[PDB]
Amino acid sequence: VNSFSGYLKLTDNVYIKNADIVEEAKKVKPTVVVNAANVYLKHGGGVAGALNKATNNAMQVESDDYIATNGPLKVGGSCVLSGHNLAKHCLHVVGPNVNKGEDIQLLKSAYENFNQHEVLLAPLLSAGIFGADPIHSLRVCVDTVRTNVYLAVFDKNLYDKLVSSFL
Ligand SMILES: NS(=O)(=O)c1nc2ccccc2[nH]1
């Protein structure tokens, strides 16, 4: 038993809620929140911009030190950094950005990072401003992630479509 409230159960291990991931993290303070990162950990917009703004830019300061030391992530890759005021840890995951020509086949690799953590609060990877079909992203999530994932979907209209079309 955990702190997540009001999620709809999709599968044995996947749960979903219409919620702003920024607000959900501040309330729950989960062990792991997933960020929809890019390879530079430049948290300008989307989920990453919103999470970073909620940390008062501390997430960006930590991220720039990480890149200065380690270089960019891979598309499909991840790193674990502080969760600041939002979570114990932030798992920064790079889904493919369709708008940049990145291979959508890398979405499954991206979601495999989630399997290194027992429970996560997460957005749909490659959704929103990363340009992928969210219905596809939820299908890959369900077919790839075996640990317990609590999905926050910001858009109420998209949430309803995701639930109503879910096989
Ligand atoms: N209401 S917000 O914190 O400014 C915000 N922006 C967001 C973009 C993508 C996903 C969740 C978001 N939340």
PDB file of C-alpha atoms and ligand atoms in Angstrom:
ATOM      1  CA  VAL A   1       0.000   0.000   0.000  1.00  0.00           C
ATOM      2  CA  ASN A   2       1.356   3.489  -1.050  1.00  0.00           C
ATOM      3  CA  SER A   3       0.318   7.217  -1.174  1.00  0.00           C
ATOM      4  CA  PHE A   4      -1.046   7.410  -4.794  1.00  0.00           C
ATOM      5  CA  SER A   5      -4.791   8.379  -4.716  1.00  0.00           C
ATOM      6  CA  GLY A   6      -7.479   8.397  -7.485  1.00  0.00           C
ATOM      7  CA  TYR A   7      -5.675   6.333 -10.198  1.00  0.00           C
ATOM      8  CA  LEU A   8      -7.519   4.054 -12.606  1.00  0.00           C
ATOM      9  CA  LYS A   9      -5.940   0.594 -12.818  1.00  0.00           C
ATOM     10  CA  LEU A  10      -5.138  -0.369 -16.516  1.00  0.00           C
ATOM     11  CA  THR A  11      -3.082  -3.562 -15.891  1.00  0.00           C
ATOM     12  CA  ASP A  12      -1.433  -5.542 -13.111  1.00  0.00           C
ATOM     13  CA  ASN A  13       1.271  -2.820 -12.835  1.00  0.00           C
ATOM     14  CA  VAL A  14       0.078   0.330 -14.779  1.00  0.00           C
ATOM     15  CA  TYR A  15      -2.188   3.013 -13.270  1.00  0.00           C
ATOM     16  CA  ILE A  16      -3.373   6.294 -14.834  1.00  0.00           C
ATOM     17  CA  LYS A  17      -4.778   9.656 -13.620  1.00  0.00           C
ATOM     18  CA  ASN A  18      -5.687  13.020 -15.184  1.00  0.00           C
ATOM     19  CA  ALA A  19      -3.272  15.102 -13.146  1.00  0.00           C
ATOM     20  CA  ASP A  20      -0.564  17.727 -13.623  1.00  0.00           C
ATOM     21  CA  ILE A  21       2.641  15.684 -12.846  1.00  0.00           C
ATOM     22  CA  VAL A  22       4.104  18.849 -11.134  1.00  0.00           C
ATOM     23  CA  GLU A  23       1.174  18.993  -8.589  1.00  0.00           C
ATOM     24  CA  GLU A  24       1.090  15.172  -8.113  1.00  0.00           C
ATOM     25  CA  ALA A  25       4.816  15.079  -7.211  1.00  0.00           C
ATOM     26  CA  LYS A  26       4.505  18.021  -4.717  1.00  0.00           C
ATOM     27  CA  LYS A  27       1.540  16.258  -2.958  1.00  0.00           C
ATOM     28  CA  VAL A  28       2.806  12.607  -3.036  1.00  0.00           C
ATOM     29  CA  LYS A  29       6.616  13.173  -2.861  1.00  0.00           C
ATOM     30  CA  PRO A  30       7.176   9.745  -4.473  1.00  0.00           C
ATOM     31  CA  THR A  31      10.466   7.787  -4.290  1.00  0.00           C
ATOM     32  CA  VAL A  32      10.919   8.327  -8.104  1.00  0.00           C
ATOM     33  CA  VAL A  33       9.424  10.927 -10.399  1.00  0.00           C
ATOM     34  CA  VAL A  34      10.222  10.520 -14.118  1.00  0.00           C
ATOM     35  CA  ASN A  35      11.217  13.572 -16.155  1.00  0.00           C
ATOM     36  CA  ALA A  36      10.646  13.729 -19.907  1.00  0.00           C
ATOM     37  CA  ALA A  37      14.229  14.779 -20.513  1.00  0.00           C
ATOM     38  CA  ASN A  38      16.287  15.558 -23.571  1.00  0.00           C
ATOM     39  CA  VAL A  39      19.903  14.339 -24.021  1.00  0.00           C
ATOM     40  CA  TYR A  40      21.231  17.749 -22.831  1.00  0.00           C
ATOM     41  CA  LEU A  41      19.031  17.817 -19.680  1.00  0.00           C
ATOM     42  CA  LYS A  42      17.924  21.277 -20.872  1.00  0.00           C
ATOM     43  CA  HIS A  43      14.585  21.548 -19.020  1.00  0.00           C
ATOM     44  CA  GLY A  44      12.981  24.321 -21.096  1.00  0.00           C
ATOM     45  CA  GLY A  45       9.375  23.264 -21.589  1.00  0.00           C
ATOM     46  CA  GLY A  46       6.861  20.471 -21.351  1.00  0.00           C
ATOM     47  CA  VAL A  47       7.075  18.215 -18.318  1.00  0.00           C
ATOM     48  CA  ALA A  48      10.803  19.029 -17.921  1.00  0.00           C
ATOM     49  CA  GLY A  49      10.272  22.817 -17.892  1.00  0.00           C
ATOM     50  CA  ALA A  50       7.379  22.453 -15.435  1.00  0.00           C
ATOM     51  CA  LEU A  51       9.259  20.101 -13.039  1.00  0.00           C
ATOM     52  CA  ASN A  52      12.370  22.288 -13.219  1.00  0.00           C
ATOM     53  CA  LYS A  53      10.353  25.479 -12.486  1.00  0.00           C
ATOM     54  CA  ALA A  54       8.821  23.775  -9.417  1.00  0.00           C
ATOM     55  CA  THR A  55      12.413  23.136  -8.108  1.00  0.00           C
ATOM     56  CA  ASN A  56      13.236  26.873  -8.423  1.00  0.00           C
ATOM     57  CA  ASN A  57      15.790  25.849 -11.180  1.00  0.00           C
ATOM     58  CA  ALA A  58      17.738  23.573  -8.754  1.00  0.00           C
ATOM     59  CA  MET A  59      17.038  20.638 -11.166  1.00  0.00           C
ATOM     60  CA  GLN A  60      18.701  22.600 -14.023  1.00  0.00           C
ATOM     61  CA  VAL A  61      21.749  23.549 -11.860  1.00  0.00           C
ATOM     62  CA  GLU A  62      22.263  19.880 -10.889  1.00  0.00           C
ATOM     63  CA  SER A  63      21.674  18.793 -14.504  1.00  0.00           C
ATOM     64  CA  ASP A  64      24.267  21.180 -15.942  1.00  0.00           C
ATOM     65  CA  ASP A  65      26.874  19.844 -13.462  1.00  0.00           C
ATOM     66  CA  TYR A  66      25.921  16.243 -14.545  1.00  0.00           C
ATOM     67  CA  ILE A  67      26.343  17.064 -18.281  1.00  0.00           C
ATOM     68  CA  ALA A  68      29.617  18.969 -17.683  1.00  0.00           C
ATOM     69  CA  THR A  69      31.024  15.789 -16.014  1.00  0.00           C
ATOM     70  CA  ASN A  70      29.404  13.005 -18.100  1.00  0.00           C
ATOM     71  CA  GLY A  71      28.329  14.433 -21.468  1.00  0.00           C
ATOM     72  CA  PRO A  72      24.883  14.021 -22.987  1.00  0.00           C
ATOM     73  CA  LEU A  73      22.556  11.062 -22.476  1.00  0.00           C
ATOM     74  CA  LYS A  74      21.562   8.731 -25.327  1.00  0.00           C
ATOM     75  CA  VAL A  75      18.072   8.906 -26.874  1.00  0.00           C
ATOM     76  CA  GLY A  76      16.462   5.926 -25.071  1.00  0.00           C
ATOM     77  CA  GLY A  77      18.700   6.459 -22.038  1.00  0.00           C
ATOM     78  CA  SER A  78      18.361   7.835 -18.494  1.00  0.00           C
ATOM     79  CA  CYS A  79      20.161   9.034 -15.418  1.00  0.00           C
ATOM     80  CA  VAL A  80      19.137   9.240 -11.777  1.00  0.00           C
ATOM     81  CA  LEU A  81      19.508  12.658 -10.093  1.00  0.00           C
ATOM     82  CA  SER A  82      17.963  14.346  -7.018  1.00  0.00           C
ATOM     83  CA  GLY A  83      14.170  14.718  -6.845  1.00  0.00           C
ATOM     84  CA  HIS A  84      14.657  18.055  -4.979  1.00  0.00           C
ATOM     85  CA  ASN A  85      11.306  19.151  -3.377  1.00  0.00           C
ATOM     86  CA  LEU A  86       9.257  16.815  -5.704  1.00  0.00           C
ATOM     87  CA  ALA A  87      10.574  13.273  -4.977  1.00  0.00           C
ATOM     88  CA  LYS A  88      13.470  11.358  -3.398  1.00  0.00           C
ATOM     89  CA  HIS A  89      14.910  10.839  -6.920  1.00  0.00           C
ATOM     90  CA  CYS A  90      14.287  12.071 -10.455  1.00  0.00           C
ATOM     91  CA  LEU A  91      14.750   9.550 -13.221  1.00  0.00           C
ATOM     92  CA  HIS A  92      15.520  11.651 -16.300  1.00  0.00           C
ATOM     93  CA  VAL A  93      14.432   9.551 -19.296  1.00  0.00           C
ATOM     94  CA  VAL A  94      14.981  10.497 -22.986  1.00  0.00           C
ATOM     95  CA  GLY A  95      12.220   9.335 -25.242  1.00  0.00           C
ATOM     96  CA  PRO A  96      12.625   9.950 -28.985  1.00  0.00           C
ATOM     97  CA  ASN A  97      11.508  13.432 -30.116  1.00  0.00           C
ATOM     98  CA  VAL A  98       9.548  12.737 -33.392  1.00  0.00           C
ATOM     99  CA  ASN A  99       9.714  16.525 -34.171  1.00  0.00           C
ATOM    100  CA  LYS A 100      13.588  16.082 -34.387  1.00  0.00           C
ATOM    101  CA  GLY A 101      13.462  12.909 -36.618  1.00  0.00           C
ATOM    102  CA  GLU A 102      14.392  10.494 -33.756  1.00  0.00           C
ATOM    103  CA  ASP A 103      13.462   6.811 -34.303  1.00  0.00           C
ATOM    104  CA  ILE A 104      10.099   6.002 -32.552  1.00  0.00           C
ATOM    105  CA  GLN A 105      11.481   2.409 -32.108  1.00  0.00           C
ATOM    106  CA  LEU A 106      13.637   3.950 -29.293  1.00  0.00           C
ATOM    107  CA  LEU A 107      10.493   4.534 -27.196  1.00  0.00           C
ATOM    108  CA  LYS A 108      10.590   0.899 -25.961  1.00  0.00           C
ATOM    109  CA  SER A 109      14.274   1.350 -24.891  1.00  0.00           C
ATOM    110  CA  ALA A 110      13.272   4.542 -23.045  1.00  0.00           C
ATOM    111  CA  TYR A 111      10.523   2.762 -21.078  1.00  0.00           C
ATOM    112  CA  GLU A 112      12.920  -0.139 -20.182  1.00  0.00           C
ATOM    113  CA  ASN A 113      14.699   2.349 -17.855  1.00  0.00           C
ATOM    114  CA  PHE A 114      11.558   2.280 -15.683  1.00  0.00           C
ATOM    115  CA  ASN A 115      12.173  -1.401 -14.842  1.00  0.00           C
ATOM    116  CA  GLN A 116      15.177  -0.438 -12.644  1.00  0.00           C
ATOM    117  CA  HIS A 117      12.724   1.132 -10.111  1.00  0.00           C
ATOM    118  CA  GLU A 118       9.975  -0.652  -8.123  1.00  0.00           C
ATOM    119  CA  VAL A 119       7.486   2.264  -8.213  1.00  0.00           C
ATOM    120  CA  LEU A 120       7.455   5.484 -10.280  1.00  0.00           C
ATOM    121  CA  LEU A 121       5.331   8.545 -10.928  1.00  0.00           C
ATOM    122  CA  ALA A 122       5.735   9.237 -14.707  1.00  0.00           C
ATOM    123  CA  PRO A 123       4.415  11.010 -17.781  1.00  0.00           C
ATOM    124  CA  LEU A 124       3.823   9.227 -21.114  1.00  0.00           C
ATOM    125  CA  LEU A 125       7.210   9.252 -22.785  1.00  0.00           C
ATOM    126  CA  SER A 126       7.554  11.012 -26.187  1.00  0.00           C
ATOM    127  CA  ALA A 127       4.042  12.517 -25.731  1.00  0.00           C
ATOM    128  CA  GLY A 128       3.206  16.209 -25.673  1.00  0.00           C
ATOM    129  CA  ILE A 129       5.868  18.403 -27.316  1.00  0.00           C
ATOM    130  CA  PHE A 130       7.997  15.285 -28.186  1.00  0.00           C
ATOM    131  CA  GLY A 131       5.448  14.685 -30.989  1.00  0.00           C
ATOM    132  CA  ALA A 132       4.580  10.950 -30.605  1.00  0.00           C
ATOM    133  CA  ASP A 133       1.031   9.496 -30.554  1.00  0.00           C
ATOM    134  CA  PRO A 134       0.166   9.189 -26.825  1.00  0.00           C
ATOM    135  CA  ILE A 135      -2.032   6.111 -27.512  1.00  0.00           C
ATOM    136  CA  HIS A 136       1.085   4.391 -28.939  1.00  0.00           C
ATOM    137  CA  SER A 137       3.177   5.566 -25.948  1.00  0.00           C
ATOM    138  CA  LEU A 138       0.669   4.055 -23.447  1.00  0.00           C
ATOM    139  CA  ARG A 139       0.671   0.746 -25.418  1.00  0.00           C
ATOM    140  CA  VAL A 140       4.524   0.606 -25.340  1.00  0.00           C
ATOM    141  CA  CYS A 141       4.443   1.500 -21.590  1.00  0.00           C
ATOM    142  CA  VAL A 142       2.032  -1.372 -20.792  1.00  0.00           C
ATOM    143  CA  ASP A 143       3.964  -3.816 -23.024  1.00  0.00           C
ATOM    144  CA  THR A 144       7.441  -2.835 -21.644  1.00  0.00           C
ATOM    145  CA  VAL A 145       7.248  -1.696 -17.982  1.00  0.00           C
ATOM    146  CA  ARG A 146       6.962  -4.513 -15.404  1.00  0.00           C
ATOM    147  CA  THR A 147       7.382  -2.351 -12.246  1.00  0.00           C
ATOM    148  CA  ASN A 148       4.536  -0.267 -10.770  1.00  0.00           C
ATOM    149  CA  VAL A 149       4.018   2.922 -12.802  1.00  0.00           C
ATOM    150  CA  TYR A 150       1.592   5.737 -11.874  1.00  0.00           C
ATOM    151  CA  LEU A 151       0.989   7.749 -15.115  1.00  0.00           C
ATOM    152  CA  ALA A 152      -0.029  11.427 -14.798  1.00  0.00           C
ATOM    153  CA  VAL A 153      -1.726  12.722 -17.975  1.00  0.00           C
ATOM    154  CA  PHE A 154      -2.047  16.558 -17.918  1.00  0.00           C
ATOM    155  CA  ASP A 155      -4.684  16.896 -20.706  1.00  0.00           C
ATOM    156  CA  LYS A 156      -8.225  15.885 -19.564  1.00  0.00           C
ATOM    157  CA  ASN A 157      -9.378  15.356 -23.169  1.00  0.00           C
ATOM    158  CA  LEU A 158      -6.362  13.095 -23.901  1.00  0.00           C
ATOM    159  CA  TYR A 159      -6.810  11.220 -20.596  1.00  0.00           C
ATOM    160  CA  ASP A 160     -10.417  10.351 -21.538  1.00  0.00           C
ATOM    161  CA  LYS A 161      -9.322   9.229 -25.026  1.00  0.00           C
ATOM    162  CA  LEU A 162      -6.468   7.110 -23.536  1.00  0.00           C
ATOM    163  CA  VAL A 163      -8.827   5.309 -21.110  1.00  0.00           C
ATOM    164  CA  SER A 164     -11.703   4.863 -23.656  1.00  0.00           C
ATOM    165  CA  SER A 165      -9.401   3.462 -26.424  1.00  0.00           C
ATOM    166  CA  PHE A 166      -7.271   1.265 -24.068  1.00  0.00           C
ATOM    167  CA  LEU A 167      -7.172  -2.436 -25.113  1.00  0.00           C
TER     168      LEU A 167
HETATM  169  N1  LIG B   1       0.858  23.834 -15.162  1.00  0.00           N
HETATM  170  S1  LIG B   1       2.546  23.680 -15.382  1.00  0.00           S
HETATM  171  O1  LIG B   1       3.203  23.309 -14.255  1.00  0.00           O
HETATM  172  O2  LIG B   1       2.957  24.919 -15.886  1.00  0.00           O
HETATM  173  C1  LIG B   1       2.806  22.345 -16.530  1.00  0.00           C
HETATM  174  N2  LIG B   1       3.275  22.407 -17.714  1.00  0.00           N
HETATM  175  C2  LIG B   1       3.302  21.191 -18.167  1.00  0.00           C
HETATM  176  C3  LIG B   1       3.641  20.684 -19.372  1.00  0.00           C
HETATM  177  C4  LIG B   1       3.607  19.307 -19.578  1.00  0.00           C
HETATM  178  C5  LIG B   1       3.162  18.473 -18.606  1.00  0.00           C
HETATM  179  C6  LIG B   1       2.780  18.948 -17.395  1.00  0.00           C
HETATM  180  C7  LIG B   1       2.857  20.350 -17.183  1.00  0.00           C
HETATM  181  N3  LIG B   1       2.576  21.134 -16.206  1.00  0.00           N
END
